[PDB]
Design a protein around this ligand. Structure first.
Ligand SMILES: [Mg+2]
Ligand SMILES: [Mg+2]
Ligand SMILES: [Mg+2]
Ligand SMILES: [Mg+2]
Ligand SMILES: [Mg+2]
Ligand SMILES: [Mg+2]
Ligand SMILES: [Mg+2]
Ligand SMILES: [Mg+2]
Ligand SMILES: [Mg+2]
Ligand SMILES: [Mg+2]
Ligand SMILES: [Mg+2]
Ligand SMILES: [Mg+2]
Ligand SMILES: [Mg+2]
Ligand SMILES: [Mg+2]
Ligand SMILES: [Mg+2]
Ligand SMILES: [Mg+2]
Ligand SMILES: [Mg+2]
Ligand SMILES: [Mg+2]
Ligand SMILES: [Mg+2]
Ligand SMILES: [Mg+2]
Ligand SMILES: [Mg+2]
Ligand SMILES: [Mg+2]
Ligand SMILES: [Mg+2]
Ligand SMILES: [Mg+2]
Ligand SMILES: [Mg+2]
Ligand SMILES: [Mg+2]
Ligand SMILES: [Mg+2]
Ligand SMILES: [Mg+2]
Ligand SMILES: [Mg+2]
Ligand SMILES: [Mg+2]
Ligand SMILES: [Mg+2]
Ligand SMILES: [Mg+2]
Ligand SMILES: [Mg+2]
Ligand SMILES: [Mg+2]
Ligand SMILES: [Mg+2]
Ligand SMILES: [Mg+2]
Ligand SMILES: [Mg+2]
Ligand SMILES: [Mg+2]
Ligand SMILES: [Mg+2]
Ligand SMILES: [Mg+2]
Ligand SMILES: [Mg+2]
Ligand SMILES: [Mg+2]
Ligand SMILES: [Mg+2]
Ligand SMILES: [Mg+2]
Ligand SMILES: [Mg+2]
Ligand SMILES: [Mg+2]
Ligand SMILES: [Mg+2]
Ligand SMILES: [Mg+2]
Ligand SMILES: [Mg+2]
Lengths: 394, 139
RNA sequence: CUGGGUCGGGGUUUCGUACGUAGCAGAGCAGCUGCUGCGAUCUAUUGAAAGUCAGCCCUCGACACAAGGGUUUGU
RNA sequence: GCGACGUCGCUUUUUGAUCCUUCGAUGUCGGCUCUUCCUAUCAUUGUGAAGCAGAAUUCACCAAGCGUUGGAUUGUUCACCCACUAAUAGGGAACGUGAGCUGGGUUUAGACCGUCGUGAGACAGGUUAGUUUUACCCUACUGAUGAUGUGUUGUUGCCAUGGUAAUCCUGCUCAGUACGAGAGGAACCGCAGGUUCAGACAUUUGGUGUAUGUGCUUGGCUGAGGAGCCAAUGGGGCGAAGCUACCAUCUGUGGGAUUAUGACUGAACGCCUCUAAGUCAGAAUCCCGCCCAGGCGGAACGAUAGCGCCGGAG
RNA sequence: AGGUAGCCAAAUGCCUCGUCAUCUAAUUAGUGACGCGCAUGAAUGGAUGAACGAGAUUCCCACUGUCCCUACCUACUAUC
RNA sequence: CAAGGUGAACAGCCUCUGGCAUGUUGGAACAAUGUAGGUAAGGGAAGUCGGCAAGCCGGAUCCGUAACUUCGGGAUAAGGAUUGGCUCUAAGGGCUGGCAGCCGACUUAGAACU
RNA sequence: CUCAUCAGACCCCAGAAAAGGUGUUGGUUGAUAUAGACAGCAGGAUGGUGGCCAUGGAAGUCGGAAUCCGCUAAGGAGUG
RNA sequence: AGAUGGUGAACUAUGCCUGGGCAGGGCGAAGCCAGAGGAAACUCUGGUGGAGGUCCGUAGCGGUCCUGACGUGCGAAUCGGUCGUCCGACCUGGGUAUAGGGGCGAAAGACUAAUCGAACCAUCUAGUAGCUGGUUCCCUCCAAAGUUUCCCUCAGGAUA
RNA sequence: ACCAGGAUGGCCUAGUGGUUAAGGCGUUGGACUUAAGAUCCAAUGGACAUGUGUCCGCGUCGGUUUUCGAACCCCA
């Protein structure tokens, strides 16, 4: 018999294999479609979720009641040191799909990227690319490499670039770098290949790939939450207090005839550590790193045009469970997936952006740098010492 | 929600709803009614088992449980002007009152009474301009 | 000539001014010819004391440790 | 738009008819929960027709994508009423769903009343009290190791297949305009928001709190002070982190072939005709993209310890 | 003998969710009445009625995770 | 048979005498789902057949107490206020030789301070 | 013979009717045809008559009863 | 099911005999004392006093609700909280009395040794069953009936 | 629905075996009384619910109709 009052189903079936992620670094499942008329650029980048803060900004939205009014918006900081490009990979189109045609690695590969090729760096004699590196010092080896590049320009339709993160500049305990294919979009295959050949062994900041007030995509893995029941996993209604064998269940898991359990019923299992692609996260800031100029350590990352302070993006006591942000970073609007210290994939948008919320121009007034390790109430330690005066600690 | 002929250009931002059906709020005007018993809220399509709920500025259907006898045993539209549930303004600032309060209105939006005791939230005041005229203090 | 770990130090933060000492502060009471006591509390030391990674941040301070062990894998 | 007198059917969401299966037992009403399916479509998309002026409402087609609520009374299915709403459509899945719950009602034993009976007792007549057992097996389902093959291993990958998701509403503007004698009264494009849903997240607000963190306090105990402890977390105030709530916050997306329909050229049928040959526009549909998983399915690359290449018979 | 005093849609009334009032926004519930009582009624006891009741119902105040709408903590498990 | 404290108390909670080794095992972790306890913003029964369960209340002192009634009750009706710690004051007794001297038990009330 | 954007496909037998189709194929009956048809393209639609009767007036041009003539290739006292 | 002869009141039901036990509080009956009032009859006030099949409530006795725990249990009826009662028709040990168509019952067909709308043991008894279940080697040859009539016959016989 | 009944003056009831239409109240006419009730003397009326069969002959017996009342409609 039919159910009387209609109720929408709990949970999306479009994320259905609710399993632990088989990758830890979020994979770009689909890169932006290439336009040969565009200049040659990168389409993706790899950062690390440092933490969150909140900003104050005036809004220019005609038709809203918040026009010329200042809002406080939640923002997430993603510490993005420059990527080092170490490889060039080409892809040929085939009626069975997109085949990896050829991979060329650079002459020098850092130990951070080398650590990715090992499951145990300590007991290894650390020998990856020690025979491949002889290709770039041999005259016949360059005479094979340049014909491999000629084969890629003749046959490949897609060019991606292998780049790895710089783990030494991060406060993480991890020093093994993350490698990633990043699809080089832009002009022809020949000039697209020449671009990556020149940027081979070189560093790419986040400024060259992304810009201020652009909507990007954040790809990552959800926070792990372990084996969870239906009440926290699929958000079903709790059964009443009088229920005998437990009230945090689903009461009926199916009718008698389909004489199985359907794949659409909520069951207990893994919740979290799920790979996700959230779209249209606005870049509210790209802040530069910690600079050493004139002997001074310039660190006024959070000093806006409305602040005139000298404070950094790092709050009081640093980020909780992360460390410091001494590299260039992306301030994104709102919440992105993952834990602190989780690797995040930043992708250029797959959509065309003609909306006012997408084309909105952002001018930050205030960046909150109070401690998140409690109810911290000062933006800077000079402000804290000015309010309190001398303590016993002198 | 409002669906009124007298409307401002910009529509209201979502606030926390602290007044479900069954909530008895203060009647903050001189109609003689002291209580407004909320029996439903305007504009809600709803969901299975979910109570309709109201924040400040949202119009509700309400009976009078205590007051003059010619106001009871019937339903009036009313507009919530104060609430104890803390709601977040778009400035990120959180405001709540110590009392839940509303005023008896009609379909068009005119209060039956002619003066309001206590403050009226800005979310109610700009959305209902005949309420904000008789408000003494605002937000 | 470098690494993490432990301790220590800073930072952050949590509560809210620690023990001791002093006070012609203290409702009063008692004993001596102004002094000596009892006395909850108060004031100063003293935004003190105490805690703070175990899943918070930074040290380049101290200490020892770290160039090891086992089991398999051949085109 | 209907439609009498007549007549042809469909369906098994009604009750019957029958007694084929089950009486060495298939747990018997409702409701709660949760998934999916149907269309005889209430709403929303696209349309045609009205005794369609506008608004509103009818009738019909493609159409089941997405919705279809909060309550008083009743055990109720059904019903009726209040209120909201885009609408508050109808159904199936052993009259879905009791090793899922509940046990209000039926339908054991106790007891009361009315009627009937000489009586024991009877009552699709009321009333009250009345034990709801077992999964550790196999499958299915959800997660979790792995398994065959590429010599071994690792890195980066591709996508065959499978799932799939967004929804609807309000306000401003158009505009008191078109339309209309007037009363009344739209729409397209834009703009701001919201509902339902989905995926997240904790900067903030709220919650938690045995950092048993830090004060306060009762009874007791360590001779007293200090420091503590016990009272199955002594009680209480505030509380870091971490988890967490439309109770805070963020995000939710593009095409193609087309259906209904409207059409173009154009015969059949010297006229005409959207159709016969040919052609166009065409949508909450369908399919793909996006997104999620990644095949006893491939690829490229790295390094390969007594092993890899090159030049004897068995 | 033809049911008197009383009482009543009662724990007794089919029709029946009886009609009116009251209670509510809305009441097949409750109370107060009405009596044509399928089928009330006087020690097969009628009517009343303080006190009492782990007895059966209705409404109100207060209070609350019963619920909107779930979340977090602790002990013993489950787990290895 | 039945000690001390608190307390009306042989209540509960802690301790001395005496007893014991946590009730047929230990170790490691802290997933769901349980069983037994807690807290929850806003609302306050909208949940449900039904306020089931949980929660509010609670002791004592000073007030104050309705309809009804078989005049006994109802009645801790309902509803209020107070309550800690400290420092005092007053009153309530006994024995010896309207007075003096010597002692001593607990209460109860009032007040100040904090 | 038949095209189905619901095709059909073999006793029992496993699904369909009344009604309907300028789909397409055949057949029956009757006309209207080389004393030249049917479309299609043009041209004439005449006087008696602008009809007694009704209706204010209707003159073929709301209605009911009159529905004959001739020059004729033809024209109903007229289908709109 | 029926019969004959026995064994049980160590559980429980009730009578009798003899023992044992029931904190601390609340309300405050009668009797009594004094004060005040009244012409009397007597009446107000304040104490006292300590009654009650009296109330809160410990032990005890019981077992309402969660329709909680458990439900191959700790347990063939237990456990937790919340509860009824707790000076009287109270609770309890031992002794004693009543025995199966009998006992005993503040009455539920309850209890009478985990047994009760007639206990338990042995025998009669291998009770009867038109009704279920089963019925043990091979090959060869032949090969049905569910119809007639009668029957307390209709799940069975006799008869053809 | 099944069984059992019941339909007669204006109302309420009698009535067979088969020949007789009965009674009460009412209506009507006359007395009594000033008049009316009460009382006295009288009179009429019946679709015998219908048609059919039996019989010489039916309101009566027997089957079928048309209106009514009574009992039962149970076990799940
Ligand atoms: Mg439905
Ligand atoms: Mg239960
Ligand atoms: Mg924080
Ligand atoms: Mg509900
Ligand atoms: Mg069976
Ligand atoms: Mg079974
Ligand atoms: Mg079954
Ligand atoms: Mg259809
Ligand atoms: Mg069923
Ligand atoms: Mg089942
Ligand atoms: Mg069950
Ligand atoms: Mg029941
Ligand atoms: Mg019974
Ligand atoms: Mg197990
Ligand atoms: Mg697919
Ligand atoms: Mg006009
Ligand atoms: Mg917080
Ligand atoms: Mg907090
Ligand atoms: Mg917190
Ligand atoms: Mg707290
Ligand atoms: Mg001390
Ligand atoms: Mg204890
Ligand atoms: Mg198209
Ligand atoms: Mg077409
Ligand atoms: Mg097209
Ligand atoms: Mg009577
Ligand atoms: Mg009710
Ligand atoms: Mg009544
Ligand atoms: Mg009787
Ligand atoms: Mg009787
Ligand atoms: Mg233990
Ligand atoms: Mg032990
Ligand atoms: Mg609450
Ligand atoms: Mg609160
Ligand atoms: Mg309710
Ligand atoms: Mg309900
Ligand atoms: Mg309770
Ligand atoms: Mg009372
Ligand atoms: Mg016999
Ligand atoms: Mg005995
Ligand atoms: Mg007693
Ligand atoms: Mg008592
Ligand atoms: Mg139970
Ligand atoms: Mg169990
Ligand atoms: Mg045990
Ligand atoms: Mg007894
Ligand atoms: Mg009985
Ligand atoms: Mg037989
Ligand atoms: Mg048989």
């Amino acid at each position: 018999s039919h159910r009387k009052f209609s109720a929408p189903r709990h949970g999306s079936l479009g994320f259905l294999p609710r399993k632990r992620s088989s990758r830890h670094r979020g994979k770009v499942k689909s890169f932006p479609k290439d336009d040969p008329s565009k200049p040659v650029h990168l389409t993706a980048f790899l950062g690390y979720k440092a933490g969150m803060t909140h900003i104050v900004r005036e809004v220019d939205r005609p038709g809203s009641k918040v026009n010329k009014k200042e809002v406080v918006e939640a923002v997430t900081i993603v510490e993005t040191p420059p990527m080092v490009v170490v490889g060039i990979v080409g892809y040929v189109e085939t009626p069975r799909g997109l085949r990896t045609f050829k991979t060329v690695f650079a002459e020098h590969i850092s130990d951070e990227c080398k650590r990715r090729f090992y499951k145990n760096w300590h007991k290894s004699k650390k020998k990856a690319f020690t025979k491949y590196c002889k290709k770039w010092q041999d005259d016949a080896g360059k005479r094979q490499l340049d014909k491999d590049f000629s084969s890629m320009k003749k046959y490949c339709q897609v060019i991606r670039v292998l780049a790895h993160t710089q783990m030494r500049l991060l406060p993480l305990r991890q020093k093994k770098a993350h490698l990633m294919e990043i699809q080089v979009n832009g002009g022809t295959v020949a000039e697209k290949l020449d671009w990556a050949r020149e940027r081979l062994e070189q560093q790419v900041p986040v400024s060259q790939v992304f810009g201020q007030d652009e909507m990007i995509d954040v790809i990552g893995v959800t926070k792990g939450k372990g084996y969870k029941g239906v009440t926290s996993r699929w958000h079903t209604k709790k059964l009443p207090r009088k229920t005998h064998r437990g009230l945090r269940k689903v009461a009926c898991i199916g009718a008698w005839h389909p004489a199985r359990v359907a794949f659409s019923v909520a069951r207990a299992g893994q919740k979290g550590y799920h790979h996700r692609t959230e779209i249209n996260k606005k870049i509210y800031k790209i802040g530069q790193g910690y600079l050493i100029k004139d002997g001074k350590l310039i660190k006024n990352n959070a000093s806006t045009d409305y602040d005139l302070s000298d404070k950094s993006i790092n709050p009081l006591g640093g980020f909780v469970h992360y460390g410091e942000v001494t590299n260039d970073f992306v301030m994104l609007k709102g919440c992105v997936v993952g834990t602190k210290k989780r690797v995040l994939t930043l992708r250029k948008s797959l959509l065309v952006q003609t909306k006012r919320r997408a084309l909105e121009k952002i001018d930050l007034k205030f960046i909150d740098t109070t401690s998140k390790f409690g109810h911290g109430r000062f933006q800077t330690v000079e402000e804290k010492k000015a309010f309190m005066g001398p303590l016993k600690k002198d | 929600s409002k669906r009124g002929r007298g409307g401002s250009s910009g529509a209201k931002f979502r606030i926390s709803l602290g007044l479900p059906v069954g909530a008895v709020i203060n009647c903050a005007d001189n109609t003689g009614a002291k209580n407004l018993y909320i029996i439903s809220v305007k504009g809600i399509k709803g969901r299975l088992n979910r109570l309709p709920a109201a924040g400040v500025g949202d119009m509700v259907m309400a009976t009078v449980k205590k007051g003059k006898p010619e106001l009871r045993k019937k339903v009036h539209p009313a507009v919530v002007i104060r609430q104890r549930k803390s709601y977040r303004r778009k400035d990120g600032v959180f405001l709540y009152f110590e009392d839940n309060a509303g005023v008896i209105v009609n379909n068009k939006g005119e209060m039956k009474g002619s003066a309001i005791t206590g403050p009226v939230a800005k979310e109610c005041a700009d959305l209902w301009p005949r309420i904000a005229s008789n408000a003494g203090s605002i937000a």
